[PDB]
Amino acid sequence: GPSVFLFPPKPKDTLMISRTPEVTCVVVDVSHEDPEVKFNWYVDGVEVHNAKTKPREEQYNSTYRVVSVLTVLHQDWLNGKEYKCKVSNKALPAPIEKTISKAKGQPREPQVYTLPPSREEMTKNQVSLTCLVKGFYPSDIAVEWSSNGQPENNYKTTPPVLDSDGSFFLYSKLTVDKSRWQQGNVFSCSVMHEALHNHYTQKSLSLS
Amino acid sequence: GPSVFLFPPKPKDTLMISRTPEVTCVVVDVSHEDPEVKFNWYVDGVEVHNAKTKPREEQYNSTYRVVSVLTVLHQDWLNGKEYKCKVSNKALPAPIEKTISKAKGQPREPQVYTLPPSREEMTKNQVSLTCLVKGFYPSDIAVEWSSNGQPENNYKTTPPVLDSDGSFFLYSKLTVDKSRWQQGNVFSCSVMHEALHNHYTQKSLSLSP
Numbered sequence: 001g002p003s004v005f006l007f008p009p010k011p012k013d014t015l016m017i018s019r020t021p022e023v024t025c026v027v028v029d030v031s032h033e034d035p036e037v038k039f040n041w042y043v044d045g046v047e048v049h050n051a052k053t054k055p056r057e058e059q060y061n062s063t064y065r066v067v068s069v070l071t072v073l074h075q076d077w078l079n080g081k082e083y084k085c086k087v088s089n090k091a092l093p094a095p096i097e098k099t100i101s102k103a104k105g106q107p108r109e110p111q112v113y114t115l116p117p118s119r120e121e122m123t124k125n126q127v128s129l130t131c132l133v134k135g136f137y138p139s140d141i142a143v144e145w146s147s148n149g150q151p152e153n154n155y156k157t158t159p160p161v162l163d164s165d166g167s168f169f170l171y172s173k174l175t176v177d178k179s180r181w182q183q184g185n186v187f188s189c190s191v192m193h194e195a196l197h198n199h200y201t202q203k204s205l206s207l208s
Numbered sequence: 209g210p211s212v213f214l215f216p217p218k219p220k221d222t223l224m225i226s227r228t229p230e231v232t233c234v235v236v237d238v239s240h241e242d243p244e245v246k247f248n249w250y251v252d253g254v255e256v257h258n259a260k261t262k263p264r265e266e267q268y269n270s271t272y273r274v275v276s277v278l279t280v281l282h283q284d285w286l287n288g289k290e291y292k293c294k295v296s297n298k299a300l301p302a303p304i305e306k307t308i309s310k311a312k313g314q315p316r317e318p319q320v321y322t323l324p325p326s327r328e329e330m331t332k333n334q335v336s337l338t339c340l341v342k343g344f345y346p347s348d349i350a351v352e353w354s355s356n357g358q359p360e361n362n363y364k365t366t367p368p369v370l371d372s373d374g375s376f377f378l379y380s381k382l383t384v385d386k387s388r389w390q391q392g393n394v395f396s397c398s399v400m401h402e403a404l405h406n407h408y409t410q411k412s413l414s415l416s417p
């Protein structure tokens with residue numbers, strides 16, 4: 001009955017020293033008469049301790065949903081250590097195990113280019129500011145937009161796309177009002193990747 | 209046990225008269241002692257019998273992967289008929305069914321914009337010509353690149369991405385040699401969509417010194 005789902009830390013957390021990367025180990029479909037679940041975590045085969053098991057979250061479909069969280073070190077994740085979650089329950093015949101780690105492969109540095117709107121789009125009510133990010137490996141990346149320190153949240157980013165070489169690329173599109181573009185406001189495409197210098201770069205975009 | 213995944217026809221196939229739109233019905237995780245799969249197709253509740261079941265594709269994880277394909281008519285897809293795939297197998301307690309159709313909703317016309325390389329990229333050996341396609345619904349679209357009549361095939365396109373409004377967008381990236389860009393050659397982003405005037409539009413891109 002019980003199923004297991006081991007999720008990696010958010011890319012933004014693994015690349016920012018201030019944040020705390022967490023590996024979460026979701027267990028679903030737990031019965032009422034077999035409610036006890038027990039986790040064991042391993043890091044390259046080495047038992048680790050002091051995980052945090054959140055309280056049982058009783059579901060709409062008359063089951064439980066237990067979650068155990070393990071905070072991992074920034075360096076250990078980015079060095080590519082394998083984190084294993086061993087679930088044990090009465091309903092299970094044999095303990096389930098899942099393993100997760102950073103996408104293995106030679107890290108490659110993204111080139112970040114900003115592209116302004118076409119003059120055809122300038123006739124429209126709003127305009128699209130484009131940020132090309134290309135040549136990065138692996139596909140674990142985070143792209144954000146901002147003006148000054150204050151962030152812009154009216155943007156979408158495309159899934160990473162595998163190129164002719166081993167690398168990836170993507171586009172991020174910030175939609176702004178035409179007025180604010182023509183007033184000469186500065187927008188900044190911030191990118192975060194493991195292969196970037198200090199895990200961060202930022203390119204600006206303005207009217208000439 | 210067995211899982212089912214019903215996929216729509218390639219957007220390029222539904223929009224080109226010469227091509228053949230197909231609905232594929234993938235069945236995964238089939239055991240060795242229950243290898244027989246049997247499909248039944250329906251079009252708005254009407255049984256059809258013109259499918260082709262491909263041979264079992266034995267997987268790396270000691271299971272099979274059976275696929276049944278149904279060719280659909282261009283007009284039937286674009287009119288929005290519902291295609292259903294009913295899988296049956298020993299391992300299943302009750303036959304599984306999945307349904308797919310064209311995304312129902314007011315069709316919206318893509319705006320097509322071409323963007324030249326940044327001057328930072330101009331230092332590199334090759335440069336990237338960008339084609340933004342935005343504001344289209346549904347997500348059935350096809351993008352090609354060309355110079356003159358002859359096509360350019362060194363390009364990649366992103367999956368359609370859902371925007372803040374109901375519409376979609378995507379980017380297509382043509383990689384060309386820096387020389388050919390600076391010689392002032394004209395490249396053309398051709399787009400094909402249900403909502404486009406005559407199901408086709410094309411925007412050009414050049415050095416424009």
Ligand SMILES: *[C@@H]1O[C@H](CO[C@@H]2O[C@@H](C)[C@@H](O)[C@@H](O)[C@@H]2O)[C@@H](O[C@@H]2O[C@H](CO)[C@@H](O[C@@H]3O[C@H](CO[C@H]4O[C@H](CO)[C@@H](O)[C@H](O)[C@@H]4O[C@@H]4O[C@H](CO)[C@@H](O)[C@H](O)[C@H]4NC(C)=O)[C@@H](O)[C@H](O[C@H]4O[C@H](CO)[C@@H](O)[C@H](O)[C@@H]4O[C@@H]4O[C@H](CO)[C@@H](O)[C@H](O)[C@H]4NC(C)=O)[C@@H]3O)[C@H](O)[C@H]2NC(C)=O)[C@H](O)[C@H]1NC(C)=O
Nearest residue numbers: 211212213215216218232234236237267268269270271273
């Ligand atoms: C044994 O191996 C096989 C083979 O797997 C392959 O080989 C192994 C060795 C590994 O390397 C695998 O990584 C590799 O894939 C396993 O078979 C796989 O089984 C899983 C399910 O367990 C299937 O997952 C689904 O995948 C589809 C997307 O699949 C397309 O894209 C894949 C790459 O991205 C590609 O590999 C596939 O072939 C397929 O590509 C399409 O193929 C068709 C025909 O081949 C073609 O016409 C198309 O053009 C082509 N398109 C593209 C884009 O490539 C994904 O959509 C599914 O997601 C749904 O279901 C999930 C539940 O599993 C759920 O979590 C998701 O959220 C999602 O659910 C849907 O969500 C929408 C939201 O709007 C909702 O509306 C829907 O109702 C909802 N549906 C459901 C059912 O919930 C899903 O992830 C793999 O496709 C399949 N792989 C292959 C190649 O067949 C097998 O499982 C292994 N067995 C064991 C025991 O381990």
Ligand SMILES: *[C@@H]1O[C@H](CO[C@@H]2O[C@@H](C)[C@@H](O)[C@@H](O)[C@@H]2O)[C@@H](O[C@@H]2O[C@H](CO)[C@@H](O[C@@H]3O[C@H](CO[C@H]4O[C@H](CO)[C@@H](O)[C@H](O)[C@@H]4O[C@@H]4O[C@H](CO)[C@@H](O)[C@H](O)[C@H]4NC(C)=O)[C@@H](O)[C@H](O[C@H]4O[C@H](CO)[C@@H](O)[C@H](O)[C@@H]4O)[C@@H]3O)[C@H](O)[C@H]2NC(C)=O)[C@H](O)[C@H]1NC(C)=O
Nearest residue numbers: 003005007008010024025026028029059060061062063065
């Ligand atoms: C009772 O209800 C439970 C609650 O779930 C919700 O409601 C039910 C009714 C359904 O509608 C659910 O789909 C819905 O989620 C059920 O639990 C769910 O079980 C299913 C199947 O066992 C799980 O499916 C798996 O989902 C994975 C992704 O999971 C993330 O995203 C989900 C939403 O998109 C979210 O519900 C999950 O909690 C989880 O969220 C992430 O959590 C981490 C922290 O742990 C965060 O860091 C992320 O940011 C979160 N992200 C998001 C988007 O929220 C899939 O990855 C997984 O697919 C993989 O495994 C399968 C094999 O199973 C492969 O085939 C596949 O290729 C892939 O590798 C799978 O689809 C679902 O996630 C569970 N939901 C929750 C909340 O735990 C109970 O099952 C249900 N019980 C019964 C008896 O019906």
